[PDB]
């Protein structure tokens, strides 16, 4: 028996800061009513394409795990805003760090495919040979948003995730997942119109709908996670109280602790960070469990707890076994360009384009 | 040890068809050039969106295989031609089908795509709770085309195939498998302003380049192709005589031809029909296995040698040990909505605008 040990984390979040503040000189919201119904204070809007904060977060995950990159034999990027179809985006950042030929592609299951990417790299390297893996969830969803509504405006920003998994002996990492789909929630959180779906010569065709029910994304997002959380915890023999830290999806704060009050899990277990980066999609996992490890929230052969949700409706759940080691090996210099503007100087262009066709 | 059987196979073309006579209509070019240069005398356009093409190929080899939508764990769908972003277009198979609770995503890396689909589910299943999954190989690439531009315009088309892989002890389906990437080959073939990349708001964004190296291509596919089918060989311990079927990717006749005679695989072995469909990216493997196996060319306990390569540029191999059964269980009846509109009706408003801003 193998498994794959997080041997490296790492993240990458552009500078360009969007402020609830910064969202109500636009729109008919206030930082009173975004605070407290979904806990977000910040986000980031970046000046890069996705490509990029994949490749910074890909950067500071292989210094912290010390592996080369002649020993990395898969690249998943699980993302919804990828540079290009044609091709992958996890073959760009191949390219950006010139590991030659790993497997590479991207997963597309929202913001739970990060968990879809750390279930499938984990299932490869234990059924074959796939030494080392990068796994990252990354996405610049800035550049799906619909400026003149509010509901999603403010919910949504940018940033990437990685891991670095190394195959062991040990006992560690993913251990028990259990990811599935409720595909009655598929119409209630979706963005129809971008993809081949689209009229591609018509000229309104950037004028989207992002459809988007709150009450019942909220309800089937407690129900898949929860489920599935419930699964995997039945499934390995763990009582509840063995969980040392939950790493949630940060969709909504309302539903970490909702996600934690019904499973009789203690609410500070929960890692959040979401005041300051807002919902980032399939990035959330792994920028919390960066930071989570960051901040000493982790310890050696802790018990956490991985749950997500996303459109779909995707859901999942994971147990990882943490091993010996929380601290970096080494440090990455790597960085974004730099970039003087503000969110707002950024998002202009969408923003007047956005305001003058309604 | 479990093993991943293929159970049930089907596919989805969709009825109209373009000739190399009609591209000669409006695009300096022959029937002469393009059957002796690609082997490709036909492809399909679809009226369809790329999930709908999905659907009908999954209805198929479900039926084929005999399997309950309650009993499919997993669905993955591998395209570069999603009808959308979010959610992901598994997930809209899922809904179409009525398949509770599966994982689903969509995987990217173009026309390899299939066979790190079918690596994908066959490593999730061997080492995790999967007892039957659904992979499909679906694209829609008449999206993408520059009806100005010969040199790709002649070489695609649209269409899906699906298999179904059930759990079992014997030693049938995939068994070694190689796949890949060689990074250093992403710019000869690529689309990169359809995406996140592109500007949302010009009103030329739909006129982007499809960047595309012929030889270039060539010379890294049959590289690439070669080294995996040849690590696929050595570590299974098949001498080359033994490989019964080879099932390929079909971008190029002469690429097929290339990759047999340097491997010592006789050329009669090979399946052939890129000159019915063309280059399909993801579903040309899971089309030819699929008319393979309805055409009487895999018998029983047969080895097959599957190959492919995409924009990436990705790679790969795998051996397939057949089981007993080559014929459905069960066929369906499901059918696309009819069309009664040729090819050239399909693509009039595409190619119009194509040769209008030229
Ligand atoms: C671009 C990338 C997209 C792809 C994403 C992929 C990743 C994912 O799928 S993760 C998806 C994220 N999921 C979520 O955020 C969870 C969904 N749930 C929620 O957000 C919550 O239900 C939430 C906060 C909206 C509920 O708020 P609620 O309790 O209804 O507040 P309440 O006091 O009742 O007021 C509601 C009203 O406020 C108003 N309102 C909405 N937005 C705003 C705003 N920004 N400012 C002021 N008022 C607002 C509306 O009129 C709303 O009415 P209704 O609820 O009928 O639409
Ligand atoms: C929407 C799709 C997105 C992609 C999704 C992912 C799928 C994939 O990634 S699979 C990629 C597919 N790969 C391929 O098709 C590569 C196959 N190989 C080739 O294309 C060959 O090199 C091929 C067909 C050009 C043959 O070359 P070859 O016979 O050696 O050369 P030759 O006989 O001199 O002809 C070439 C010349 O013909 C001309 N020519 C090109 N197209 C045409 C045409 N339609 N009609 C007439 N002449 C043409 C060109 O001037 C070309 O010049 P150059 O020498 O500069 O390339
Ligand atoms: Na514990
Ligand atoms: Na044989």
């Given at each position: 028996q193998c498994y794959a040990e997080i041997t490296g984390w790492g993240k990458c979040l552009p500078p360009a800061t969007l402020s609830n503040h910064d969202l109500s000189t636009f729109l008919d919201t206030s930082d009173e009513w975004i605070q407290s119904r979904t806990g977000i204070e910040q986000r980031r809007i970046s000046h890069v394409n996705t490509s990029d904060l994949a490749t910074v977060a890909a950067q500071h995950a292989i210094a912290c795990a010390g592996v080369?990159?002649?020993?990395?034999d898969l690249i998943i990027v699980a993302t919804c805003?990828?540079?290009?179809?044609?091709?992958?985006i996890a073959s760009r950042v191949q390219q950006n760090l010139g590991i030659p030929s790993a497997a590479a592609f991207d997963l597309n299951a929202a913001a739970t495919g990060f968990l879809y990417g750390l279930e499938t790299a984990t299932r490869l390297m234990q059924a074959s040979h796939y030494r080392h893996a990068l796994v990252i969830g990354a996405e610049?969803?800035?550049?799906?948003?619909?400026?003149?509504?509010?509901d999603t405006a403010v919910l949504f920003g940018d940033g990437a995730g990685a891991v670095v998994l190394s195959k062991t002996?040990?006992?560690?990492?993913?251990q028990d997942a259990q990811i599935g789909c409720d595909?009655?929630?598929?119409?209630?959180?979706?963005?129809?119109?971008?993809?081949?779906?689209?009229?591609?010569?018509?000229?309104?065709?950037?004028?989207?709908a992002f459809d988007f029910v709150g009450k019942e994304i909220f309800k089937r997002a407690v129900r898949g996670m929860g489920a599935a959380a419930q699964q995997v915890l039945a499934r390995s023999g763990?009582?509840?109280?063995?969980?040392?830290?939950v790493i949630p999806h940060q969709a909504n704060i309302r539903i970490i602790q909702t996600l934690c009050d019904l499973a009789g899990?203690?609410?500070?277990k929960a890692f959040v960070n979401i005041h300051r980066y807002g919902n980032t999609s399939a990035a959330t996992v792994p920028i919390a469990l960066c930071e989570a490890l960051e901040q000493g929230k982790i310890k050696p052969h802790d018990d956490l707890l991985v749950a997500a949700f996303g459109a779909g409706l995707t859901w999942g759940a994971g147990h990882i076994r943490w091993g010996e080691?929380?601290?970096?090996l080494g440090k990455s210099d790597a960085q974004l360009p730099s970039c003087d503007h503000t969110a707002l100087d950024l998002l202009s262009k969408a923003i007047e384009h956005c305001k003058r066709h309604q």
């Open positions: 080369s990159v002649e020993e990395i805003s990828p540079d290009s179809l044609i091709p992958n610049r969803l800035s550049f799906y948003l619909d400026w003149t509504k509010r002996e040990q006992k560690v990492g993913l595909a009655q929630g598929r119409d209630i959180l979706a963005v129809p119109k971008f993809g081949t779906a689209m009229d591609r010569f018509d000229a309104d065709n950037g004028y989207w763990l009582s509840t109280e063995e969980i040392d830290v899990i203690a609410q500070d080691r929380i601290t970096p």
